[PDB]
Write a protein that binds this ligand. Structure first.
Ligand code: G2F
Ligand code: ZN
Length: 471
């Protein structure tokens, strides 16, 4: 069951929470004044999502939020990570404020605080207002720094007297990779793609604009709001572990290149004020250059680093070669390997990419500790999924997820006990929800949602957390 885990097993004041995102749980997608996001358009196109499903209703947290807050309190959590939908506040992304949308987030924030749950609020979670994509070209346009800063400024002004823990973005790497390299997520851009694109250049432009936008929003917070509000702003980055397949110089170099192209892409700017040297060396003029002023704005602009952690891969490499650029992915010059000594690195959850590898959690956390001066880290996503078509009772008896959290949290504890500066941990997700391309066919919740009736039922993993987290 608990395997020796409890509040006592983690540092004093360590924060435990659950996480959702706006489009994945709110519903009321075209109601309450909300304007469309790029995901509304994408999900409404036949063939784009499993079963042609979409987030129109999702879990209907918009109507049920007091139920869900009551539930998280009953499970002994300290905090809730959620996102504000930009197009719920500004239907066109700029200009007119939707007061009904503002009222929803006020109501949610106020109820959280009433119930003793700390809000950790993300400003952006893949849901760019569609109007901004069409008018400006979204994250390809450097003007996004201004547009995002004005949106952030409004949120700081309106909610920041109560909200003290912000994040700007969720997983800029995934937007760059899936939206602009592979072209499998909105705006579906890539070298071969019908929408246009260039997999060798656009991912780097987009990443750069996320970094500049984050920096501009934080500078606005620090200069205009922080003295009065006394809160913090971070950023959420995905990081999955890479382990050299062998101890060869080439395999070790490959694993390190992968780390640099994956997490270094953002952390070297945010902590050290420059892109990783290897990215400079290999990507050359396709990697934008920060001016000294921009680099100084970006360096130190995250008060904490959210890390989204799921899995690990073995990496194989060879000698670096001169090659015609094709894509961000190809630029790494690495070979993924998912077995060693005839054994898979771990069993898979429902998602094909999700190998259950608890030691990857230690790997990631220790790596950031040792390489980047031990910055304050919050694990802002960790969890696993069940498949579609199970019975209610099969969903509830989620013994594999219980094992997942016990093992991964044991590994996190190992890193923390060795000195890693981890301040909190958030389980993805409180609720089964809309899993992007997988629609409702992937179930990540510690709480089961019946998508016919919308009823919530805590799974065994929810009660595991309740027991572990009891005060
Ligand atoms: C992190 O991962 C989960 C599982 O794939 C997604 O549902 C979240 O939106 C993402 F932030
Ligand atoms: Zn409803």
């Amino acid at each position: 069951w608990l395997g020796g885990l409890s509040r006592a097993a983690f540092p004093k004041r360590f924060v435990f929470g659950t996480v959702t995102s706006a489009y994945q749980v709110e519903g009321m997608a075209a109601s309450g004044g909300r304007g469309p996001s790029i995901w509304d358009a994408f999900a409404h196109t036949p063939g784009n999502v499993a079963g042609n499903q979409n987030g129109d209703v999702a879990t209907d947290q918009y109507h049920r939020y007091k139920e869900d807050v009551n539930l998280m309190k009953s499970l002994n959590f300290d905090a809730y990570r959620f996102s504000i939908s930009w197009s719920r506040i500004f239907p066109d992304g700029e200009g007119r404020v939707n007061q009904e949308g503002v009222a929803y987030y006020n109501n949610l924030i106020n109820y959280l605080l009433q119930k003793g749950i700390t809000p950790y609020v993300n400003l952006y979670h893949y849901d760019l207002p569609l109007a901004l994509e069409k008018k400006y070209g979204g994250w390809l346009n450097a003007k996004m720094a201004d547009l995002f800063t004005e949106y952030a400024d409004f949120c700081f002004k309106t909610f920041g007297n109560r909200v003290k823990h912000w994040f700007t973005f969720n997983e800029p790497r995934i937007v760059a990779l899936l939206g602009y390299d592979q072209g499998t997520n909105p705006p579906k851009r890539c070298t071969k793609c019908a929408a246009g694109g260039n997999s060798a250049t656009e991912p780097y432009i987009v990443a750069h604009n996320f970094l500049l936008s984050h920096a501009a929003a934080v500078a606005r917070y620090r200069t205009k709001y922080q003295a009065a509000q006394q809160g913090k702003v971070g950023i959420v980055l995905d990081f999955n572990w890479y382990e050299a397949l062998s101890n060869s110089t080439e395999d070790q170099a490959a694993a390190q290149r992968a780390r640099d192209f994956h997490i270094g892409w953002y952390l070297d700017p945010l902590i050290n004020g420059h892109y990783p040297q290897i990215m400079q060396d290999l990507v050359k003029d396709r990697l934008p250059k920060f001016t000294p002023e921009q680099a100084r704005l970006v360096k130190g602009s995250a008060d904490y680093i959210g890390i989204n952690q799921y899995t690990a891969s073995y990496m194989k490499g060879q000698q670096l070669m001169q090659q015609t650029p094709t894509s961000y992915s190809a630029d790494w010059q690495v070979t993924y390997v998912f077995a060693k000594n005839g054994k898979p690195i771990g069993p898979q959850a429902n998602s094909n990419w999700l190998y259950i590898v608890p030691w990857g959690m230690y790997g990631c956390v220790n790596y950031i500790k040792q390489k980047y001066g031990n910055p304050t880290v919050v694990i802002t996503e960790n969890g696993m999924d069940q498949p579609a078509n199970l019975s209610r009772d099969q969903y509830l008896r989620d013994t594999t997820r219980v094992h997942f959290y016990r093992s991964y949290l044991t590994q996190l504890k190992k890193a923390i006990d060795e000195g890693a500066n981890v301040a909190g941990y958030f389980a993805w997700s409180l609720l089964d929800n809309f899993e992007w391309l997988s629609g409702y066919t992937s179930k990540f919740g510690i709480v089961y949602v019946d998508f016919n009736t919308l009823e919530r039922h805590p799974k065994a993993s929810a009660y595991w957390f309740r027991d572990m987290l009891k005060h």
